[PDB]
Amino acid sequence: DEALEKDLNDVSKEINLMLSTYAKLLSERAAVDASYIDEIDELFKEANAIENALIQKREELRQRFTAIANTLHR
Amino acid sequence: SMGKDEALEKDLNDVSKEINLMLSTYAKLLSERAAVDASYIDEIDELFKEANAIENALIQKREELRQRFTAIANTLHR
Amino acid sequence: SMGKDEALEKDLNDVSKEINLMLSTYAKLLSERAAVDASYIDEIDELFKEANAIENALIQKREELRQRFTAIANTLHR
Amino acid sequence: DEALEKDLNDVSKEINLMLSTYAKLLSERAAVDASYIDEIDELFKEANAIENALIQKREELRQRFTAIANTLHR
Ligand SMILES: [Ca+2]
Ligand SMILES: [Ca+2]
Ligand SMILES: [Ca+2]
Ligand SMILES: [Ca+2]
Ligand SMILES: [Ca+2]
Ligand SMILES: [Ca+2]
Ligand SMILES: [Ca+2]
Ligand SMILES: [Ca+2]
Ligand SMILES: [Ca+2]
Ligand SMILES: [Ca+2]
Ligand SMILES: [Ca+2]
Ligand SMILES: [Ca+2]
Ligand SMILES: [Ca+2]
Ligand SMILES: [Ca+2]
């Protein structure tokens, strides 16, 4: 019911809106990826600190067990 | 009482659960991105096809006006 | 070695963190619902207004056809 | 460029699609709410079991401390 010229201008506006919206969404992905990488890195560092402490504690237990055994069996 | 080794094992499991949840949340975000990307392509394709059809009809409309004014000019001379 | 009381305190904190995350995820889902509800109202309103305008124009179109056929009938008798 | 009758039928289809889609979304909220309530309930029960065990352990520590004190100060 509107002229073809008017309808062409309406659809062009729809295109520009979708393009501008998607461009924005795409431009934001890098910072989101960077945030996940940063936070996963923090968690892996936390896990590695716990794991390392567990390794140390297990070696101390090995040494305590060996010492008690040697004292008891001579 | 209990061993610190046991407590450290438990704390390592706690952080492993957090890592697994973060990795799975990120994997989900990537799936949502893929579906968004494909939907954009479908939808922008529909819009560009509609725009080109309107554009082609508008070109035809201007030529129809040219033809109709030419026919009037010929009618005036009759 | 360490006390089981300390280990239990730590485990209680671990579950409290999970509760807090679940409560906040649910609070987020409710916010998304509210925005969805309001968007539905905006969008269905636009559609019903468009439908009523088309409907009213169609009623007018049928009456215009009635008027145009009546005028033809009067022209035929001239 | 289409007749008003055709356009009325197109918009009616759009309405029915939006209504049917929203009705579905609304009908699904109860099961989602129920799932959150169920899972939060499981977590609170887990937390209460830990808390209760901590209360018991603290009372045992109170009794061990009192007994050692009495033995040492007579
Ligand atoms: Ca038109
Ligand atoms: Ca238009
Ligand atoms: Ca390590
Ligand atoms: Ca813990
Ligand atoms: Ca398609
Ligand atoms: Ca499509
Ligand atoms: Ca073209
Ligand atoms: Ca824990
Ligand atoms: Ca509105
Ligand atoms: Ca609106
Ligand atoms: Ca009406
Ligand atoms: Ca029309
Ligand atoms: Ca139509
Ligand atoms: Ca309790």
Tokens of D33: 């709410």
- Cβ contact A50:B12 at 8 Å: yes
DSSP 8-state class, residue C2? B
d(CA B29, CA C28): 16
Report how far residue D74's alpha carbon sits from residue D16's, in angstroms, rounded to the nearest whole number: 86
Q: In the beta sheet, which residues pair with residue C2?
A: B2
Resolution value, angstrom units: 1.5
**Closest to C47 in 3D by CA, of D14, D7, D1, D23:** D14
* Helix, strand, or coil (residue B2): strand
**Cα distance between residue C66 and residue C38, in whole Å:** 43
What DSSP letter does each residue of C12-30 carry, written as one string?
A: HHHHHHHHHHHHHHHHHHH
Distance from CA of B77 to the nearest CA of A (A): 31
> Locate tokens 């009456």: which residue?
C63
CA C71 – CA C65 distance, rounded (Å): 10
Burial class (CB in 10 A: 0-12, 13-18, 19+), A40: middle
The token pair that represents A21 in the structure block? 């919206």
The residue in chain C having the minimum alpha-carbon distance to the alpha carbon of residue B15 is: C14
Residue B49 alpha carbon to ligand 5 centre in Å: 11
Cβ-Cβ contacts under 8 Å, A8 against chain B = 51, 54-55, 58
Q: Are B36 and A23 in contact (CB under 8 A)?
A: no
Across the interface, of B36, B48, B54, the residue whose CB is closest to A8 is B54
A18 and B47 in contact by Cβ < 8 A? yes
Q: Tokens 């960077």 label which residue?
A: A34
Q: Does A11 touch chain B (CB under 8 A)?
A: yes
Residue in A4, A22, A40 closest to B61 by CB: A4
Query: B8 exposed, middle or buried (CB, 10 Å; 0-12, 13-18, 19+)?
Result: buried
Q: Where are the domains of chain B?
A: 1-78
CA distance C43 to C50: 11
A23: contact with B, CB 8 A cutoff: no
Looking at all shown ligands, the one closest to residue D55's CA atom is 14
Record the tokens describing residue D46, joined without a space: 């887990």
- Give CA angle at C7 (B17, B8), nearest 5°: 55
